[PDB]
Amino acid sequence: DDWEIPDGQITVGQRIGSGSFGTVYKGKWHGDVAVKMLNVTAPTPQQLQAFKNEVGVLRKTRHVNILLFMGYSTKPQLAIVTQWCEGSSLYHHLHASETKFEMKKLIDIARQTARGMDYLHAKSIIHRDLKSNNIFLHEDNTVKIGDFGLATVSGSILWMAPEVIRMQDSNPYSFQSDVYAFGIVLYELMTGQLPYSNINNRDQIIEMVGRGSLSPDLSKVRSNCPKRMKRLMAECLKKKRDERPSFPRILAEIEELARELS
Amino acid sequence: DWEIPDGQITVGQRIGSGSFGTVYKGKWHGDVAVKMLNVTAPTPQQLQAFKNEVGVLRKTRHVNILLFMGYSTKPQLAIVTQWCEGSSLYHHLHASETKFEMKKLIDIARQTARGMDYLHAKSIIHRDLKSNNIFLHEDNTVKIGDFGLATVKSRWSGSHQFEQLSGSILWMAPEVIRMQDSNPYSFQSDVYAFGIVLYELMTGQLPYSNINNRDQIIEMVGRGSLSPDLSKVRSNCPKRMKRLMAECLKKKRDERPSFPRILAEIEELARELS
Ligand SMILES: CC(C)(C#N)c1cccc(C(=O)Nc2ccc(F)c(C(=O)c3c[nH]c4ncc(Cl)cc34)c2F)c1
Ligand SMILES: CC(C)(C#N)c1cccc(C(=O)Nc2ccc(F)c(C(=O)c3c[nH]c4ncc(Cl)cc34)c2F)c1
Ligand SMILES: [Br-]
Ligand SMILES: [Br-]
Ligand SMILES: [Br-]
């Protein structure tokens, strides 16, 4: 089949912000869409490769908790077209609005995020930038994982595993670094706070997290955080990469502990 | 690319069986639905039905179309899609006495029109649009599916069709009822079915509620002597929907509007109501 959308069909609307490359707009194409466009005369080879990589990855995904890819265009500009997400990111809800979710809902958000991540890893896709700003709460209820960059909101230091934040080597990312980022998301859900909220300097966070002398303060977890969720968070946040669990185990554990409440 | 290896899906509760095969709830990176088409070695018919359904579904990526997720071929031919949670529009309107506000009735029409506009843009004729194939997922997003697609298909254009397709008679365009072409289905017959959905939304009733048997409906819709009673729309029915419904139900198929136009009209109404 083919996902190329002919020029002229999409009506490009309000500008939302910068994406992971290019600029994101709300658009119309058989309903609402998002359109991420590279607004340049001619793309560099690097820009073309980034576009191709993103289309290549997105076209491999069909899951309710992954942003729905819908098509692309290459002329007159490189564009990636996806569903429109209605609502706000998890970051916005937790930290900006400080939305007060019930524990059942917090655990369901964790569950849905774990399903999306389990799916990506099953498809051999590393996210590399999981964080609450990249977890969209569509229609205030269905998690959509994306890589929205600035459209939703250095901006990712708090979710970086120690091996990533240490800049250990030229590509320190793995499924296990995604797991660590998911541990930080669990921290955000279960505490309603960002980690290191009282550390005022980013360089200090970089040095101390990387050395293992700073880690998230698990005393901040809400009093009705289930013990099994606290333990799972601690496993996801293990400082040594190879000690962290895989997503199939994470997901199974969340599904179990969710049943136990309900 | 979309083949799911055997062993990965945990096939759970059986939800329903019929001419479509058997649908189960399952687990595979979260909830899924799994439709199995055979139990023993598949016939060539079953295999071609499977291939066609995967081929149609893999052309679709739209929020208002049931999300295809994958397939398996052993030990059973299986089509894997998202799980839908909730009830169909038919169940709401006709089995549950759900009372939707007008803004919500129009949003249902709007999301249905988006999905149908999309299918038609992809050159896909649905062939069985009706309120029971409009799923109100999490009561907030419409998912159009074909939740009763029969695997075995008759070769004979005639009168035993209407027994098996008894669940769809109310949504069949007159030229579909008459079967004067070997395949009388078109984009325009999908539009007619959408007209009947609009009727359901704006009246809260099925068409032909006082006609007491299907044979009479087949005969009279085919002859042009029975039409839905458009006067029965509820007092809050927008004027735009009265006109639009009548246009979708036009007897001459080429006089019905296309989905781009239908969608644009409903989007304008939704703005006016908001
Ligand atoms: C598969 C994976 C690894 C994940 N996960 C991945 C890899 C690379 C990129 C993306 C990725 O998500 N791309 C992407 C493309 C086009 C867009 F418009 C947007 C985009 O900002 C939006 C798409 N709907 C939206 N509704 C609302 C708002 Cl405010 C923004 C958007 C977008 F983020 C995802
Ligand atoms: C694109 C088009 C023309 C449309 N529109 C079309 C053509 C042919 C077939 C289908 C089609 O939809 N197939 C299909 C395949 C697998 C399934 F499990 C189910 C299925 O009953 C369900 C899929 N989730 C479900 N949640 C809950 C419940 Cl109760 C049932 C299901 C299913 F209906 C759709
Ligand atoms: Br695809
Ligand atoms: Br009857
Ligand atoms: Br009937």
Coordinates of C-alpha atoms and ligand atoms in Angstrom, one line a residue:
Chain A
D1 CA 0.0 0.0 0.0
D2 CA 0.9 3.7 0.1
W3 CA 0.8 6.6 2.5
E4 CA 1.8 9.5 0.4
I5 CA -0.8 12.3 0.5
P6 CA -1.1 14.3 -2.7
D7 CA -0.3 18.0 -2.6
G8 CA -3.4 20.2 -2.0
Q9 CA -5.5 17.8 0.1
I10 CA -4.4 19.0 3.5
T11 CA -5.6 22.4 4.8
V12 CA -2.8 23.6 7.1
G13 CA -4.2 25.5 10.0
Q14 CA -3.0 27.0 13.3
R15 CA 0.7 26.8 14.1
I16 CA 1.3 24.8 17.3
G17 CA 5.1 24.8 17.7
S18 CA 8.4 23.2 16.8
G19 CA 8.5 19.4 16.5
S20 CA 11.5 17.1 16.8
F21 CA 12.3 18.6 13.4
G22 CA 10.3 21.2 11.6
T23 CA 7.0 22.9 12.7
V24 CA 3.7 21.3 13.8
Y25 CA 0.3 22.7 12.7
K26 CA -3.3 21.6 13.2
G27 CA -4.8 20.7 9.9
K28 CA -7.8 19.3 8.1
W29 CA -7.7 16.1 6.1
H30 CA -10.8 13.9 6.4
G31 CA -11.2 15.4 9.8
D32 CA -8.5 16.8 12.2
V33 CA -4.9 16.0 11.7
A34 CA -1.5 17.2 12.9
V35 CA 1.0 18.1 10.2
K36 CA 4.7 18.4 10.9
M37 CA 6.4 20.3 8.1
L38 CA 10.0 21.2 7.3
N39 CA 9.7 24.7 6.1
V40 CA 12.8 25.0 4.0
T41 CA 13.6 25.6 0.3
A42 CA 15.6 22.4 0.0
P43 CA 16.2 19.8 2.7
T44 CA 19.8 18.8 3.7
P45 CA 20.7 15.1 3.4
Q46 CA 20.5 15.0 7.2
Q47 CA 17.0 16.5 7.2
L48 CA 15.9 14.0 4.5
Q49 CA 17.3 11.1 6.5
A50 CA 15.6 12.3 9.6
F51 CA 12.3 12.5 7.8
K52 CA 12.8 9.1 6.2
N53 CA 13.7 7.6 9.6
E54 CA 10.6 9.0 11.2
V55 CA 8.2 7.9 8.5
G56 CA 9.9 4.4 8.5
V57 CA 9.4 4.0 12.3
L58 CA 5.9 5.4 12.4
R59 CA 4.7 3.3 9.5
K60 CA 5.7 0.2 11.6
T61 CA 3.3 1.2 14.4
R62 CA -0.4 0.3 14.8
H63 CA -1.4 0.5 18.5
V64 CA -3.9 2.4 20.4
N65 CA -1.3 3.9 22.8
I66 CA 1.1 5.1 20.0
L67 CA 0.3 8.3 18.1
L68 CA -1.5 7.3 14.9
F69 CA 0.6 7.9 11.8
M70 CA -1.6 8.8 8.8
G71 CA 0.6 9.8 5.9
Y72 CA 3.4 11.9 4.5
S73 CA 4.2 14.4 1.7
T74 CA 7.5 15.2 0.1
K75 CA 6.5 18.1 -2.2
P76 CA 6.6 21.0 -1.9
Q77 CA 8.0 20.3 1.6
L78 CA 8.7 17.3 3.7
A79 CA 5.6 16.6 5.9
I80 CA 4.5 14.0 8.4
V81 CA 0.8 13.7 9.0
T82 CA -0.7 12.0 12.1
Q83 CA -3.9 12.0 14.2
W84 CA -4.7 15.2 16.1
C85 CA -4.6 14.7 19.9
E86 CA -7.2 16.6 21.9
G87 CA -6.3 17.6 25.3
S88 CA -3.0 18.0 27.0
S89 CA 0.2 16.1 27.8
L90 CA 0.7 14.2 31.1
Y91 CA 3.4 16.8 32.0
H92 CA 0.8 19.6 31.6
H93 CA -1.8 17.8 33.7
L94 CA 0.6 16.8 36.5
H95 CA 2.9 19.8 36.7
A96 CA 1.2 22.8 35.1
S97 CA -2.5 22.3 35.8
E98 CA -1.7 20.0 38.7
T99 CA -4.8 17.9 37.8
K100 CA -5.8 15.7 40.8
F101 CA -6.2 12.2 39.4
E102 CA -7.6 9.4 41.5
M103 CA -5.1 6.5 42.1
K104 CA -7.1 4.2 39.8
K105 CA -6.7 6.7 36.9
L106 CA -3.0 7.2 37.7
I107 CA -2.4 3.4 37.6
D108 CA -4.4 3.2 34.3
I109 CA -2.2 5.9 32.8
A110 CA 0.9 3.9 33.9
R111 CA -0.8 0.7 32.4
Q112 CA -1.5 2.3 29.0
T113 CA 2.0 3.9 28.8
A114 CA 3.5 0.4 29.5
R115 CA 1.3 -1.1 26.8
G116 CA 2.6 1.4 24.2
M117 CA 6.2 0.9 25.3
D118 CA 5.9 -2.8 25.3
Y119 CA 4.6 -2.6 21.8
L120 CA 7.4 -0.3 20.6
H121 CA 10.1 -2.6 22.1
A122 CA 8.4 -5.7 20.5
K123 CA 8.7 -3.9 17.2
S124 CA 12.4 -3.2 17.9
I125 CA 11.8 0.5 18.3
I126 CA 13.7 2.5 21.1
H127 CA 11.9 5.7 22.0
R128 CA 15.0 7.6 23.3
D129 CA 12.9 10.5 24.8
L130 CA 10.1 9.1 26.9
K131 CA 8.9 11.7 29.4
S132 CA 5.6 13.0 30.5
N133 CA 5.5 15.7 27.9
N134 CA 5.6 12.9 25.3
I135 CA 2.6 11.1 26.8
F136 CA -0.5 12.7 25.5
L137 CA -3.8 12.3 27.4
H138 CA -6.1 12.2 24.4
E139 CA -9.7 13.1 25.2
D140 CA -8.4 13.2 28.8
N141 CA -8.3 9.4 28.9
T142 CA -6.3 7.5 26.3
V143 CA -2.6 7.7 26.4
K144 CA -0.8 8.4 23.1
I145 CA 2.9 8.1 23.2
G146 CA 4.7 10.4 20.6
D147 CA 7.8 12.4 20.2
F148 CA 6.2 15.8 20.2
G149 CA 9.3 17.9 21.0
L150 CA 8.4 21.5 21.7
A151 CA 4.8 21.2 20.4
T152 CA 3.5 19.9 23.8
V153 CA 5.7 22.1 26.0
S154 CA 17.8 19.7 28.5
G155 CA 14.1 19.4 28.6
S156 CA 14.9 15.7 29.1
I157 CA 17.6 15.6 31.8
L158 CA 15.2 14.5 34.5
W159 CA 14.2 11.3 32.6
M160 CA 17.8 10.3 31.5
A161 CA 19.3 7.1 33.0
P162 CA 22.7 7.5 34.7
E163 CA 24.5 6.0 31.7
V164 CA 22.8 8.5 29.4
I165 CA 23.3 11.6 31.6
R166 CA 27.0 10.6 32.2
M167 CA 27.6 10.8 28.4
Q168 CA 29.3 7.5 28.7
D169 CA 29.7 6.9 25.0
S170 CA 28.4 8.2 21.7
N171 CA 25.1 6.3 21.8
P172 CA 24.3 5.1 25.4
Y173 CA 20.5 4.5 24.7
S174 CA 18.8 1.1 25.0
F175 CA 15.5 -0.5 25.9
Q176 CA 16.8 -0.2 29.5
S177 CA 17.2 3.6 29.3
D178 CA 13.6 3.7 28.1
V179 CA 12.7 1.6 31.2
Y180 CA 14.5 4.2 33.4
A181 CA 12.6 7.0 31.8
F182 CA 9.3 5.1 32.4
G183 CA 10.4 4.8 36.1
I184 CA 10.6 8.6 36.2
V185 CA 7.1 8.8 34.7
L186 CA 5.9 6.4 37.4
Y187 CA 7.6 8.7 39.9
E188 CA 5.7 11.7 38.4
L189 CA 2.4 9.8 38.5
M190 CA 2.8 8.5 42.1
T191 CA 4.2 11.7 43.6
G192 CA 2.6 14.4 41.5
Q193 CA 6.1 16.0 41.3
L194 CA 9.2 16.1 39.2
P195 CA 12.3 14.4 40.6
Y196 CA 14.9 16.7 42.2
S197 CA 12.4 19.5 42.7
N198 CA 14.6 21.1 45.4
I199 CA 17.9 20.9 43.4
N200 CA 18.2 24.3 41.8
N201 CA 21.1 23.7 39.4
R202 CA 21.0 21.5 36.3
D203 CA 24.8 20.8 36.3
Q204 CA 24.5 19.4 39.8
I205 CA 21.8 17.0 38.7
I206 CA 23.9 15.9 35.7
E207 CA 26.9 15.2 37.9
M208 CA 25.2 13.5 40.8
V209 CA 22.7 11.4 38.9
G210 CA 25.5 10.3 36.6
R211 CA 27.7 9.3 39.7
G212 CA 24.8 7.6 41.6
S213 CA 24.9 10.1 44.5
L214 CA 21.5 11.6 43.6
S215 CA 18.3 9.6 42.8
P216 CA 14.6 10.3 43.1
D217 CA 13.2 10.7 46.6
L218 CA 10.7 7.9 46.9
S219 CA 9.4 9.3 50.2
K220 CA 7.3 11.7 48.0
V221 CA 5.0 8.9 46.8
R222 CA 1.4 9.4 47.8
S223 CA 0.2 7.4 50.8
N224 CA -2.1 5.2 48.7
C225 CA 0.5 4.4 46.1
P226 CA 0.3 0.5 46.0
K227 CA 3.5 -1.1 47.5
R228 CA 3.9 -3.2 44.3
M229 CA 3.9 0.0 42.2
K230 CA 6.6 1.6 44.5
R231 CA 8.7 -1.5 44.2
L232 CA 8.2 -1.6 40.4
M233 CA 9.3 2.0 40.2
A234 CA 12.4 1.3 42.2
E235 CA 13.3 -1.6 39.8
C236 CA 12.8 0.6 36.7
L237 CA 15.1 3.3 38.3
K238 CA 18.0 0.9 39.1
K239 CA 21.2 2.8 38.6
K240 CA 22.8 -0.2 36.8
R241 CA 21.3 -0.6 33.3
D242 CA 21.3 -4.4 33.3
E243 CA 19.4 -4.6 36.6
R244 CA 16.2 -3.0 35.2
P245 CA 13.2 -5.1 34.1
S246 CA 11.9 -5.5 30.5
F247 CA 8.6 -4.1 29.4
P248 CA 6.8 -7.5 29.2
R249 CA 7.6 -7.9 32.9
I250 CA 6.7 -4.3 33.7
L251 CA 3.4 -4.6 31.9
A252 CA 2.5 -7.9 33.5
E253 CA 3.2 -6.5 36.9
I254 CA 1.1 -3.3 36.4
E255 CA -1.8 -5.4 35.0
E256 CA -1.6 -7.6 38.2
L257 CA -1.4 -4.8 40.7
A258 CA -4.2 -2.9 38.8
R259 CA -6.4 -6.0 39.2
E260 CA -5.7 -6.2 42.9
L261 CA -7.2 -2.7 43.5
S262 CA -10.3 -3.5 41.4
Chain B
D1 CA 5.3 -6.8 8.4
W2 CA 1.9 -7.2 10.2
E3 CA 2.1 -11.0 10.7
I4 CA 2.0 -11.8 14.4
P5 CA 3.9 -15.0 15.3
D6 CA 2.0 -17.9 16.9
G7 CA 2.1 -17.9 20.7
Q8 CA 2.2 -14.1 21.3
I9 CA -1.6 -13.5 21.6
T10 CA -3.4 -14.8 24.7
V11 CA -6.8 -15.5 23.3
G12 CA -9.4 -14.8 26.0
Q13 CA -13.2 -14.6 26.3
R14 CA -15.3 -15.6 23.3
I15 CA -17.5 -12.6 22.5
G16 CA -19.6 -13.9 19.6
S17 CA -19.7 -16.4 16.8
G18 CA -21.6 -16.4 13.5
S19 CA -21.2 -16.1 9.8
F20 CA -18.2 -13.8 10.4
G21 CA -16.3 -16.5 12.3
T22 CA -15.6 -16.1 16.0
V23 CA -14.4 -13.0 17.8
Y24 CA -12.5 -13.2 21.1
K25 CA -11.0 -10.6 23.4
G26 CA -7.3 -11.1 23.7
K27 CA -4.1 -9.8 25.2
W28 CA -1.2 -8.7 23.0
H29 CA 0.7 -5.6 24.3
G30 CA -2.6 -4.7 25.9
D31 CA -6.2 -5.4 24.8
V32 CA -7.0 -6.7 21.3
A33 CA -9.9 -8.3 19.5
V34 CA -9.1 -11.4 17.5
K35 CA -11.4 -12.7 14.8
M36 CA -10.8 -16.3 13.8
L37 CA -12.1 -17.4 10.4
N38 CA -11.6 -21.2 10.6
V39 CA -10.9 -24.1 12.9
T40 CA -9.9 -26.9 10.6
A41 CA -7.5 -26.4 7.5
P42 CA -8.9 -23.4 5.7
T43 CA -10.8 -23.7 2.3
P44 CA -9.6 -21.6 -0.6
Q45 CA -12.7 -19.4 0.0
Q46 CA -11.7 -18.9 3.6
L47 CA -8.2 -18.1 2.6
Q48 CA -9.2 -15.6 0.0
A49 CA -11.8 -13.9 2.4
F50 CA -8.9 -13.6 5.0
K51 CA -6.5 -12.1 2.5
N52 CA -9.1 -9.6 1.2
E53 CA -10.1 -8.5 4.7
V54 CA -6.4 -8.0 5.7
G55 CA -5.9 -6.2 2.4
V56 CA -8.8 -3.8 3.0
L57 CA -8.0 -3.1 6.6
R58 CA -4.2 -2.5 6.0
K59 CA -5.2 0.5 3.8
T60 CA -6.7 2.3 6.8
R61 CA -5.1 4.6 9.3
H62 CA -7.8 7.0 10.7
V63 CA -9.1 7.7 14.2
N64 CA -12.7 6.8 13.2
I65 CA -11.9 3.5 11.5
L66 CA -11.4 0.3 13.7
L67 CA -7.6 0.0 14.1
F68 CA -6.2 -3.0 12.3
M69 CA -3.2 -4.4 14.2
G70 CA -2.1 -7.6 12.6
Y71 CA -2.9 -11.1 11.5
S72 CA -1.9 -14.7 12.1
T73 CA -2.1 -17.7 9.8
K74 CA -1.4 -20.7 12.1
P75 CA -3.1 -22.5 13.6
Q76 CA -6.1 -20.4 12.6
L77 CA -6.5 -17.5 10.2
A78 CA -6.9 -14.6 12.6
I79 CA -7.4 -10.9 12.1
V80 CA -6.3 -8.8 15.1
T81 CA -7.6 -5.3 15.7
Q82 CA -8.0 -2.9 18.6
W83 CA -10.5 -3.8 21.3
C84 CA -13.6 -1.5 21.3
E85 CA -15.1 -0.8 24.8
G86 CA -18.7 0.3 25.0
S87 CA -21.7 -0.2 22.7
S88 CA -22.8 0.4 19.1
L89 CA -24.9 3.3 18.1
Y90 CA -27.7 0.8 17.4
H91 CA -27.5 -0.6 20.9
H92 CA -27.6 2.9 22.4
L93 CA -30.5 4.2 20.4
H94 CA -32.6 1.1 20.0
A95 CA -31.8 -1.3 22.8
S96 CA -30.8 1.1 25.7
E97 CA -32.9 4.3 25.5
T98 CA -29.8 6.4 25.6
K99 CA -30.8 10.1 25.4
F100 CA -28.0 12.0 23.7
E101 CA -28.0 15.8 23.6
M102 CA -28.0 17.4 20.2
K103 CA -24.4 18.4 20.3
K104 CA -23.5 14.8 20.9
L105 CA -25.8 13.5 18.2
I106 CA -24.2 15.8 15.8
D107 CA -20.7 14.8 17.0
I108 CA -21.6 11.2 16.3
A109 CA -22.7 12.2 12.8
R110 CA -19.5 14.2 12.3
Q111 CA -17.1 11.5 13.4
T112 CA -19.0 8.9 11.3
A113 CA -18.8 11.3 8.3
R114 CA -15.0 11.7 8.9
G115 CA -14.5 8.0 8.8
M116 CA -16.6 7.5 5.7
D117 CA -15.0 10.4 3.9
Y118 CA -11.7 8.7 4.7
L119 CA -12.8 5.3 3.4
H120 CA -14.1 6.8 0.2
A121 CA -10.8 8.8 -0.3
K122 CA -9.0 5.4 0.0
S123 CA -11.5 4.0 -2.6
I124 CA -13.1 1.7 -0.1
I125 CA -16.8 1.1 -0.3
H126 CA -18.0 0.0 3.2
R127 CA -21.0 -2.0 1.8
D128 CA -22.7 -2.4 5.2
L129 CA -22.8 0.9 7.0
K130 CA -25.5 0.9 9.7
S131 CA -25.8 2.0 13.3
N132 CA -24.7 -1.4 14.7
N133 CA -21.4 -1.0 12.8
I134 CA -20.8 2.4 14.4
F135 CA -19.1 1.7 17.7
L136 CA -19.2 4.4 20.4
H137 CA -15.8 3.6 21.9
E138 CA -15.2 4.8 25.5
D139 CA -18.5 6.7 24.6
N140 CA -16.3 9.5 23.0
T141 CA -14.8 8.2 19.8
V142 CA -16.7 6.6 16.9
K143 CA -15.0 3.6 15.4
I144 CA -16.6 2.4 12.2
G145 CA -16.2 -1.4 11.6
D146 CA -17.8 -4.2 9.8
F147 CA -18.6 -6.3 12.9
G148 CA -20.7 -8.9 10.9
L149 CA -18.8 -9.6 7.7
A150 CA -19.9 -13.0 6.5
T151 CA -17.0 -15.2 5.2
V152 CA -19.2 -17.3 2.9
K153 CA -20.7 -15.2 0.1
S154 CA -23.5 -16.3 -2.2
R155 CA -22.9 -16.3 -5.9
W156 CA -26.5 -15.7 -6.7
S157 CA -28.0 -12.2 -7.0
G158 CA -31.5 -12.9 -5.5
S159 CA -34.1 -13.4 -2.6
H160 CA -32.2 -15.6 -0.1
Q161 CA -29.8 -12.7 0.4
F162 CA -32.4 -10.8 2.3
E163 CA -32.7 -13.5 5.0
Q164 CA -29.0 -13.5 5.8
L165 CA -28.7 -9.7 5.4
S166 CA -32.0 -9.2 7.4
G167 CA -30.0 -7.1 9.8
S168 CA -29.2 -4.6 7.2
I169 CA -32.5 -4.1 5.2
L170 CA -33.3 -0.8 6.8
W171 CA -30.0 0.8 5.5
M172 CA -30.1 -0.7 2.0
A173 CA -30.5 1.9 -0.9
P174 CA -33.4 1.2 -3.3
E175 CA -30.9 0.1 -6.0
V176 CA -29.3 -2.3 -3.6
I177 CA -32.7 -3.8 -2.7
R178 CA -33.6 -4.2 -6.4
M179 CA -30.3 -6.0 -7.3
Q180 CA -30.6 -5.1 -11.0
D181 CA -26.8 -5.1 -11.3
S182 CA -24.7 -8.0 -10.1
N183 CA -22.9 -5.7 -7.6
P184 CA -25.2 -2.7 -7.0
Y185 CA -23.0 -1.2 -4.2
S186 CA -21.3 2.1 -4.6
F187 CA -20.1 5.2 -2.7
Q188 CA -23.6 6.5 -3.2
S189 CA -25.2 3.4 -1.5
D190 CA -22.9 4.1 1.5
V191 CA -24.2 7.7 1.5
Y192 CA -27.8 6.4 1.5
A193 CA -27.0 4.2 4.5
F194 CA -25.5 7.2 6.2
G195 CA -28.8 9.0 5.5
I196 CA -30.6 6.3 7.4
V197 CA -28.1 6.7 10.3
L198 CA -28.9 10.5 10.3
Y199 CA -32.6 9.5 10.5
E200 CA -31.9 7.4 13.5
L201 CA -29.9 10.1 15.2
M202 CA -32.5 12.9 14.5
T203 CA -35.6 10.9 15.2
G204 CA -34.3 8.5 17.9
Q205 CA -36.2 5.8 15.9
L206 CA -35.6 3.2 13.2
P207 CA -37.2 4.0 9.8
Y208 CA -40.4 2.1 8.9
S209 CA -41.2 1.5 12.6
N210 CA -44.9 0.9 11.6
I211 CA -44.2 -1.5 8.7
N212 CA -44.6 -4.9 10.2
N213 CA -42.6 -7.2 8.0
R214 CA -39.4 -7.1 6.0
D215 CA -41.0 -8.4 2.7
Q216 CA -43.2 -5.3 2.6
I217 CA -40.1 -3.1 3.0
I218 CA -38.2 -4.9 0.3
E219 CA -41.1 -4.6 -2.1
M220 CA -42.1 -1.0 -1.4
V221 CA -38.6 0.5 -1.1
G222 CA -37.7 -1.3 -4.3
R223 CA -40.8 0.1 -6.1
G224 CA -40.3 3.6 -4.7
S225 CA -43.5 3.6 -2.6
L226 CA -42.0 3.6 0.9
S227 CA -39.7 6.3 2.3
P228 CA -38.7 7.2 5.8
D229 CA -41.1 9.6 7.6
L230 CA -38.9 12.7 7.8
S231 CA -41.5 14.6 9.7
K232 CA -40.7 12.5 12.8
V233 CA -37.4 14.3 13.6
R234 CA -37.3 15.6 17.1
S235 CA -38.2 19.2 17.7
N236 CA -34.5 20.2 18.2
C237 CA -33.4 18.7 14.8
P238 CA -31.3 21.4 13.1
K239 CA -32.7 22.6 9.8
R240 CA -29.4 21.7 8.1
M241 CA -29.9 18.0 9.1
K242 CA -33.4 17.9 7.6
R243 CA -32.0 18.9 4.3
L244 CA -28.9 16.8 4.5
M245 CA -30.8 13.7 5.5
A246 CA -33.3 14.1 2.5
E247 CA -30.3 14.5 0.1
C248 CA -28.6 11.4 1.3
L249 CA -31.8 9.4 0.9
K250 CA -32.4 10.5 -2.7
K251 CA -33.8 7.7 -4.9
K252 CA -31.5 8.4 -7.8
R253 CA -28.1 7.4 -6.6
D254 CA -26.2 10.2 -8.5
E255 CA -28.3 12.9 -6.8
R256 CA -26.9 11.9 -3.4
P257 CA -24.1 14.2 -2.1
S258 CA -20.5 12.9 -1.7
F259 CA -18.9 12.5 1.7
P260 CA -16.6 15.6 1.3
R261 CA -19.7 17.7 1.0
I262 CA -21.6 15.8 3.7
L263 CA -18.7 16.2 6.1
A264 CA -18.2 19.9 5.4
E265 CA -22.0 20.6 6.0
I266 CA -21.9 18.7 9.4
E267 CA -18.6 20.5 10.4
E268 CA -20.4 23.8 9.8
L269 CA -23.3 22.8 11.8
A270 CA -21.2 21.6 14.7
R271 CA -19.5 25.0 14.7
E272 CA -22.8 26.8 14.8
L273 CA -23.9 24.7 17.8
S274 CA -20.6 25.0 19.8
Ligands
LIG1 C1 7.1 6.0 17.2 C2 7.8 7.1 18.1 C3 9.1 6.5 18.6 C4 6.9 7.3 19.2 N1 6.3 7.5 20.1 C5 8.0 8.4 17.3 C6 9.2 8.6 16.6 C7 9.4 9.8 15.9 C8 8.5 10.8 16.0 C9 7.2 10.6 16.6 C10 6.2 11.7 16.6 O1 5.3 11.6 17.5 N2 6.0 12.4 15.5 C11 5.1 13.5 15.2 C12 4.8 13.6 13.8 C13 3.9 14.6 13.4 C14 3.3 15.3 14.4 F1 2.4 16.3 14.0 C15 3.6 15.3 15.8 C16 2.9 16.1 16.8 O2 3.6 17.0 17.4 C17 1.5 15.9 17.0 C18 0.8 14.9 16.5 N3 -0.5 15.0 16.9 C19 -0.6 16.1 17.8 N4 -1.7 16.5 18.4 C20 -1.6 17.6 19.2 C21 -0.4 18.2 19.4 CL1 -0.3 19.6 20.5 C22 0.8 17.8 18.7 C23 0.6 16.7 17.9 C24 4.5 14.3 16.1 F2 4.9 14.3 17.4 C25 7.0 9.4 17.3
LIG2 C1 -12.7 -1.1 6.6 C2 -14.1 -1.7 6.8 C3 -14.9 -1.5 5.5 C4 -14.8 -0.9 7.9 N1 -15.3 -0.3 8.6 C5 -14.1 -3.2 7.2 C6 -14.1 -4.2 6.2 C7 -14.1 -5.5 6.6 C8 -14.0 -5.9 7.9 C9 -14.0 -4.9 8.9 C10 -14.0 -5.3 10.4 O1 -14.3 -4.4 11.2 N2 -13.3 -6.4 10.7 C11 -13.1 -6.9 12.0 C12 -11.9 -7.7 12.2 C13 -11.6 -8.2 13.4 C14 -12.4 -8.0 14.5 F1 -12.1 -8.5 15.7 C15 -13.7 -7.4 14.4 C16 -14.6 -7.2 15.5 O2 -15.7 -7.7 15.5 C17 -14.1 -6.4 16.6 C18 -13.0 -5.7 16.6 N3 -12.8 -5.0 17.8 C19 -13.9 -5.3 18.6 N4 -14.1 -4.8 19.8 C20 -15.2 -5.3 20.4 C21 -16.2 -6.1 19.8 CL1 -17.6 -6.5 20.6 C22 -15.9 -6.5 18.5 C23 -14.8 -6.1 17.9 C24 -13.9 -6.9 13.1 F2 -15.2 -6.3 12.9 C25 -14.0 -3.6 8.5
BR3 BR 0.4 0.2 7.6
BR4 BR -40.2 -10.0 9.0
BR5 BR -36.2 -5.7 10.7

